[PDB]
Scaffold this active site. Structure first.
Site, PDB file in Angstrom:
ATOM      1  N   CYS A   1       0.811  -1.206   0.000  1.00  0.00           N
ATOM      2  CA  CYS A   1       0.000   0.000   0.000  1.00  0.00           C
ATOM      3  C   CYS A   1       0.845   1.256   0.000  1.00  0.00           C
ATOM      4  O   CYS A   1       0.465   2.255  -0.617  1.00  0.00           O
ATOM      5  CB  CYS A   1      -0.884  -0.013   1.224  1.00  0.00           C
ATOM      6  SG  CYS A   1       0.133  -0.176   2.683  1.00  0.00           S
TER       7      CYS A   1
ATOM      8  N   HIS B   1       2.531   5.161   9.321  1.00  0.00           N
ATOM      9  CA  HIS B   1       1.674   4.093   8.850  1.00  0.00           C
ATOM     10  C   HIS B   1       0.689   3.724   9.944  1.00  0.00           C
ATOM     11  O   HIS B   1       1.019   3.775  11.126  1.00  0.00           O
ATOM     12  CB  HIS B   1       2.550   2.903   8.482  1.00  0.00           C
ATOM     13  CG  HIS B   1       1.890   1.897   7.607  1.00  0.00           C
ATOM     14  ND1 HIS B   1       1.605   2.147   6.285  1.00  0.00           N
ATOM     15  CD2 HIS B   1       1.525   0.618   7.834  1.00  0.00           C
ATOM     16  CE1 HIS B   1       1.058   1.076   5.745  1.00  0.00           C
ATOM     17  NE2 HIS B   1       0.990   0.136   6.666  1.00  0.00           N
TER      18      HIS B   1
HETATM   19  N1  LIG Z   1      -3.412  -4.347   6.400  1.00  0.00           N
HETATM   20  C1  LIG Z   1      -3.439  -3.495   5.388  1.00  0.00           C
HETATM   21  O1  LIG Z   1      -4.019  -2.415   5.439  1.00  0.00           O
HETATM   22  C2  LIG Z   1      -2.705  -3.881   4.133  1.00  0.00           C
HETATM   23  C3  LIG Z   1      -2.431  -2.986   3.118  1.00  0.00           C
HETATM   24  C4  LIG Z   1      -1.818  -3.420   1.972  1.00  0.00           C
HETATM   25  C5  LIG Z   1      -1.465  -4.740   1.860  1.00  0.00           C
HETATM   26  N2  LIG Z   1      -1.685  -5.600   2.862  1.00  0.00           N
HETATM   27  C6  LIG Z   1      -1.290  -7.019   2.730  1.00  0.00           C
HETATM   28  O2  LIG Z   1      -2.481  -7.773   2.683  1.00  0.00           O
HETATM   29  C7  LIG Z   1      -2.244  -9.077   3.244  1.00  0.00           C
HETATM   30  C8  LIG Z   1      -3.361  -9.392   4.206  1.00  0.00           C
HETATM   31  O3  LIG Z   1      -3.691  -8.212   4.966  1.00  0.00           O
HETATM   32  P1  LIG Z   1      -4.880  -8.347   6.023  1.00  0.00           P
HETATM   33  O4  LIG Z   1      -4.900  -7.150   6.910  1.00  0.00           O
HETATM   34  O5  LIG Z   1      -6.140  -8.735   5.328  1.00  0.00           O
HETATM   35  O6  LIG Z   1      -4.356  -9.584   6.882  1.00  0.00           O
HETATM   36  P2  LIG Z   1      -5.090 -10.256   8.128  1.00  0.00           P
HETATM   37  O7  LIG Z   1      -4.117 -11.109   8.865  1.00  0.00           O
HETATM   38  O8  LIG Z   1      -5.816  -9.178   8.858  1.00  0.00           O
HETATM   39  O9  LIG Z   1      -6.153 -11.199   7.403  1.00  0.00           O
HETATM   40  C9  LIG Z   1      -5.648 -12.326   6.654  1.00  0.00           C
HETATM   41  C10 LIG Z   1      -6.696 -13.408   6.662  1.00  0.00           C
HETATM   42  O10 LIG Z   1      -6.187 -14.563   5.945  1.00  0.00           O
HETATM   43  C11 LIG Z   1      -6.304 -15.691   6.775  1.00  0.00           C
HETATM   44  N3  LIG Z   1      -5.289 -16.658   6.391  1.00  0.00           N
HETATM   45  C12 LIG Z   1      -3.954 -16.605   6.692  1.00  0.00           C
HETATM   46  N4  LIG Z   1      -3.273 -17.615   6.215  1.00  0.00           N
HETATM   47  C13 LIG Z   1      -4.221 -18.391   5.569  1.00  0.00           C
HETATM   48  C14 LIG Z   1      -4.127 -19.603   4.863  1.00  0.00           C
HETATM   49  N5  LIG Z   1      -2.990 -20.267   4.689  1.00  0.00           N
HETATM   50  N6  LIG Z   1      -5.267 -20.110   4.341  1.00  0.00           N
HETATM   51  C15 LIG Z   1      -6.409 -19.436   4.520  1.00  0.00           C
HETATM   52  N7  LIG Z   1      -6.613 -18.289   5.160  1.00  0.00           N
HETATM   53  C16 LIG Z   1      -5.468 -17.812   5.670  1.00  0.00           C
HETATM   54  C17 LIG Z   1      -6.124 -15.125   8.175  1.00  0.00           C
HETATM   55  O11 LIG Z   1      -6.477 -16.034   9.191  1.00  0.00           O
HETATM   56  C18 LIG Z   1      -7.075 -13.937   8.050  1.00  0.00           C
HETATM   57  O12 LIG Z   1      -8.408 -14.426   8.020  1.00  0.00           O
HETATM   58  C19 LIG Z   1      -0.825  -9.017   3.821  1.00  0.00           C
HETATM   59  O13 LIG Z   1       0.092  -9.397   2.808  1.00  0.00           O
HETATM   60  C20 LIG Z   1      -0.644  -7.514   4.010  1.00  0.00           C
HETATM   61  O14 LIG Z   1       0.713  -7.118   4.096  1.00  0.00           O
HETATM   62  C21 LIG Z   1      -2.276  -5.184   4.011  1.00  0.00           C
END
Ligand SMILES: NC(=O)c1ccc[n+]([C@@H]2O[C@H](COP(=O)([O-])OP(=O)(O)OC[C@H]3O[C@@H](n4cnc5c(N)ncnc54)[C@H](O)[C@@H]3O)[C@@H](O)[C@H]2O)c1
Ligand SMILES: NC(=O)c1ccc[n+]([C@@H]2O[C@H](COP(=O)([O-])OP(=O)(O)OC[C@H]3O[C@@H](n4cnc5c(N)ncnc54)[C@H](O)[C@@H]3O)[C@@H](O)[C@H]2O)c1
Ligand SMILES: NC(=O)c1ccc[n+]([C@@H]2O[C@H](COP(=O)([O-])OP(=O)(O)OC[C@H]3O[C@@H](n4cnc5c(N)ncnc54)[C@H](O)[C@@H]3O)[C@@H](O)[C@H]2O)c1
Ligand SMILES: NC(=O)c1ccc[n+]([C@@H]2O[C@H](COP(=O)([O-])OP(=O)(O)OC[C@H]3O[C@@H](n4cnc5c(N)ncnc54)[C@H](O)[C@@H]3O)[C@@H](O)[C@H]2O)c1
Lengths: 337, 337, 337, 337
Positions: free
Chosen positions: A154, A181
């Site tokens: 992001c 952030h």
């Molecule tokens: N948080 C943000 O605002 C943001 C911004 C840009 C990019 N990202 C990227 O997005 C990705 C996810 O962000 P998020 O906040 O949604 O993460 P999160 O941890 O809040 O949610 C991830 C979800 O995926 C599930 N999960 C994890 N491993 C899994 C697997 N092997 N099989 C099935 N489900 C699985 C988790 O249990 C959870 O439900 C990361 O790479 C993060 O760096 C996040």
């Protein structure tokens, strides 16, 4: 019409689903599969009642243990951590949206390709030479046989359009950044055990610093600036939105008003819908849910010595990033091969 | 022994009182007068029970309506908003410590000089050509007939020793800064009416940006860099400690390890007690109550292109700034004229 | 059509203005005057960009230094702290809405009546025998010659419909309450000097307790329970919404399901639009902007020993309270005398 | 001297270790083994730099990959999730301190007894008829052949001494409680998938309610009140300390001053070191690190109708609970069998 899927129904997944529910009519994409580590009863509740974007209002959300009815539209749902046991060819999946934060490698993400999916769009800066694409900079230059594409972080997704505009208009020698952030889900709430020590500490209490290479990903998406962009990140106790500071060392000298003029006209000619330009004295929470991937804050832009510029950009790393993910997904649907 | 006074028993005043209670034996200063807009019963409670530094432990705090007994030591206390009706010559006051955030002008602060005080040390970047002095940079070069002296802001008080070290070792052409600042008392808690719009919004919710000239105050305390240093501030919802980013454009080229070496030896030769050097992966709340006015974070220092350096510095704007105020007060007591 | 005015354009005033902008067509009320201690340029910005309810969307907000154009509709605006120098008869004001938190006495609020206003509705539990009225309990029983009426506090405005239902259905001997209250603007942000010591401490850091008599105001609006209802309040670091615990000692014995049934049918017959009934497992932030003045949380209702009941009620003390203020204002417009 | 161990080096484990480092000389306990899911390099850092209790100061903390040197005192450390593969008899372990929040059953906790440990003290309200003991109520009445003992939750550990005093002095018919609880590590930071829906939502944003049976655990530790005590909990965004409301229905009538007198003399005769009594107007953060397991807040105690009492009690659920764990451990060391 392209049947698409979502791996990991977390923050990015829920925001992706909510965006597609708000952009349904103009879509060549139909969301047909999700999988989270939770049962289908819980994540429908988490979709309807987001404690950040409020209660969803336009369509009705309900579920039973096998499917989820969003506004009458049915969507399938399953739960497995192994990507190899997943019904992709059984569901007819062209594009899966990797959003677990786990499968960043090529060999990890290619497990879906092996298990019966045609293309994968991973929403993370992937390890290894995965082709990365940012909407508004180089969303045109992807080859449609590249089935494993990556959107960057992001921070990169916000920063790279500004760096593109300033590199085209002025030329950049070097450049730093320091993004303030919002706290993400990776940080432990209280002081708990964690792989990295600066993310092990409490999130609501602390400015925790972290080193990121997401500034260098601009050097991937803009090739002639690689090895010239680096920066750190500061996680502060705000839940949703964030701001990025950016110090560039341009070589064509200018003043603070002219770079604002350049970005203002670039907001209206080329970066329309990517960069918004705001001459208001707003604050952070007035950007929850903004559609642009970078709001340039006008009053803080400054130039010292002619050849040293600083901009700051508000950006929502949970909503605008999801918007760019969905725009990249539709743009790869429009050039399906 | 120098009889000193405190105008405004707020955060800086309570921290000044607590510091003097912790540095009592080596002091040529005896605190004999305070005045706040509160009664003497309340502010003794606020002195004893600080919700940031915990309960004070070493000495006993009590009060009645005319005096405050801190550890057996009596101190007088009064309440008036007019500085002209204040018993200064009746109390024998050499130095009053202006800490209300109101009397920043020369004509405002000189009201205490008129009302019967001999010197005033104001803890704010004052309007007009008030002589400013930072401990560790130019705390020697004050003339003792300058009765109205000013310590700068906490951001300047942190940033200027680092800029002094980097200007002496490398030479600075230009320099930006962006301090991620803890929220101060000026911001309204909920969205309430305020003179500046970006401070009018909620403090616990928002990254509120603000423009500051406290980067330019380094150009006051270092004369050959004036008009070359500018920066903004970001107020994030952390209550106590803050970090400052600093981007300089040096001209003698170097690498990231060498500037860390320079500041590490400057921490041990000249800036001892001013700049601490930390090669730990700490976070913000491990600097609540640190004695140094700048902890250089080692792992984040970076140099791009040889001639473009970025450092970050943790600093406590409520405790270390009070320490520098008390050190400047003792240093003007040691050269009383 | 009744020309109305707003004294104090704070949280309650901005929410009142936003509610009237969302309930314009069915209104016998036209808002024609406001006064805050700020200039008309600032509070229009604070009206448009609320950091709690987001950016206002339906109508356009602009201002110059004498009037404010909300959606084309003009409204006058002035600034004075003396209520006696205010142009009320010059503007033709029937009802002024006291919302400063200052004029709680009869003699304070009657200054507007003297200065040329016809009725005053004060949004605070007033000192002295001011006639108090809650919409949904006793909004009928006001005499229209009572020009100085008072709505109670938000806690009372939430609690009293539940106490009315349980007193009619079961009969109440005694009753406690303990509202977990969101932090209000009266608390100082950092530890600053304040009239009450438990509000002097930091708001974002602390559960600060406070004693309130707003539980006793139910004994005003329900006369046969006066001197039988008392409770305290807990201010916790949430900005917007709050929950109230309520322990009653009924005398007609029952179980936990039956009181839920009673309140569920009372939500659909008499308290419709006042009490909403929710059998969901929601949390606090899913009640930002709810229209009901009490959402009964169903899963937590419990009865011990047959004659001892506990309910909890979510309520928004910034939006639903404004809704009840506007409903009381329209209901006194419908019975203008 | 009793060789003891710690299962799970989380918040309770780090606080237990810090307490034993502060109570070393009077101890029959020597901490010789810990195990966490982290490597020994990380948790030594987390022990030294707690973002809640500040930097530890008295003794030096260092580690390598096999042992941890705390103040020169060596302690062993391992990492395994299976309790059956653990070197207990190889280390000579009498008492292991279960603090993972996982092994609440008898069959779960007895895995350590099978694997070569002699007694287990679990810091959780265990499922099944595990003998529970609270220091200050019934820490005498344990049989030393009961090797699997349980301390209750922190809420029960605070509430039960007050209920003991009020039951002995007045006699209790029924009793409710509503603890305003600090957020614990179980809640997800952002809105993430979780087994219970009300803990799935964001912790820093929300008052999340939860149903607990920890009020009923008073009916275990006081047998004649079982089935008469029930209550809910409110998790609010404060990181450390919490307060518990308690509504009892006594039968011997009294006033509000007399119950304060009873608890004040019980603080000085029997509950000394358990219940502290405070007639100050303190707030939450002035109880970070208090040694008593319940500070009765004096100014808020109230009685309606003679037979209905409400008290509130501050308690630190991370420090005082660890103190009671260590006191129970020493008290079972003093009666080793
Ligand atoms: N948080 C943000 O605002 C943001 C911004 C840009 C990019 N990202 C990227 O997005 C990705 C996810 O962000 P998020 O906040 O949604 O993460 P999160 O941890 O809040 O949610 C991830 C979800 O995926 C599930 N999960 C994890 N491993 C899994 C697997 N092997 N099989 C099935 N489900 C699985 C988790 O249990 C959870 O439900 C990361 O790479 C993060 O760096 C996040
Ligand atoms: N807040 C910080 O961490 C910090 C850091 C560096 C410098 N400063 C500067 O210190 C000053 C005060 O900071 P603070 O946090 O203590 O402010 P504050 O507002 O928290 O406390 C100031 C105190 O002075 C009282 N006061 C104000 N005007 C007065 C008057 N005319 N007569 C008597 N008493 C009066 C206030 O009521 C309050 O008691 C400001 O200039 C601020 O910019 C603050
Ligand atoms: N905060 C809540 O959610 C809430 C809920 C129910 C009731 N109330 C009551 O509403 C009242 C106001 O609440 P608020 O949050 O809007 O308060 P606030 O302090 O946030 O806003 C009050 C506004 O009135 C202005 N004002 C004060 N005195 C004035 C005067 N003499 N002349 C002109 N303007 C003046 C203030 O400067 C500010 O602009 C208080 O009685 C409060 O107890 C508040
Ligand atoms: N949080 C509080 O203030 C508090 C108060 C009273 C009681 N408790 C109880 O204490 C227990 C732990 O609390 P906490 O805050 O320390 O929890 P936590 O989750 O913060 O820390 C627990 C630690 O144990 C580790 N762990 C978990 N399962 C393990 C296993 N099988 N093997 C090895 N290590 C394992 C975790 O990874 C973590 O390092 C829970 O039962 C909780 O309810 C907590």
């Amino acid at each position: 019409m392209v049947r698409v899927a979502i791996n990991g129904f977390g923050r990015i997944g829920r925001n992706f689903m909510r965006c597609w529910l708000q952009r349904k009519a103009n879509s060549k994409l139909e969301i047909v599969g999700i999988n989270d580590t939770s049962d289908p009863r819980t994540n429908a509740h988490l979709l309807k009642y987001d404690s950040m974007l409020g209660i969803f209002q336009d369509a009705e959300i309900t579920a039973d243990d096998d499917c989820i009815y969003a506004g009458g539209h049915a969507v399938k749902c399953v739960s497995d951590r192994n990507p190899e046991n997943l019904p992709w060819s059984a569901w007819g999946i062209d594009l899966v949206i990797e959003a677990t934060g786990v499968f960043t490698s090529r060999e990890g993400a290619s497990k879906h390709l092996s298990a019966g999916a045609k293309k994968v769009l991973i929403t993370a800066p992937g390890k290894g030479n995965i082709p990365t694409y940012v909407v508004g900079v180089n969303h045109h230059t992807y080859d449609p046989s590249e089935d494993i594409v990556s959107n960057a972080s992001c921070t990169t997704n916000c920063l790279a359009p500004i760096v593109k505009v300033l590199h085209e208009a002025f030329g950049i020698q070097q450049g730093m950044m320091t993004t303030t952030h919002s706290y993400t889900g990776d940080q432990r709430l209280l002081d708990a055990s964690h792989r990295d020590l600066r993310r092990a500490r409490a999130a609501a209490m602390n400015i925790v610093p972290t080193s990121t290479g997401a500034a260098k990903a601009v050097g991937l998406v803009i090739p002639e600036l690689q090895g010239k962009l680096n920066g750190i990140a500061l996680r502060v106790p705000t839940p949703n939105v964030s701001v990025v500071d950016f110090v560039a060392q341009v070589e064509k000298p200018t003043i603070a008003e002219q770079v604002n003029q350049v970005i203002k006209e670039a907001s209206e000619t080329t970066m329309k819908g990517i960069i918004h330009y705001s001459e208001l004295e707003l604050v952070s929470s007035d950007y929850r849910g903004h559609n642009a991937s970078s709001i340039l804050d006008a009053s803080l832009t400054m130039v010292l010595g002619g050849n040293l510029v600083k901009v700051v950009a508000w950006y929502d790393n949970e909503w605008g990033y999801s918007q760019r993910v969905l725009d990249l997904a539709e743009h790869m649907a429009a050039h399906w091969a």
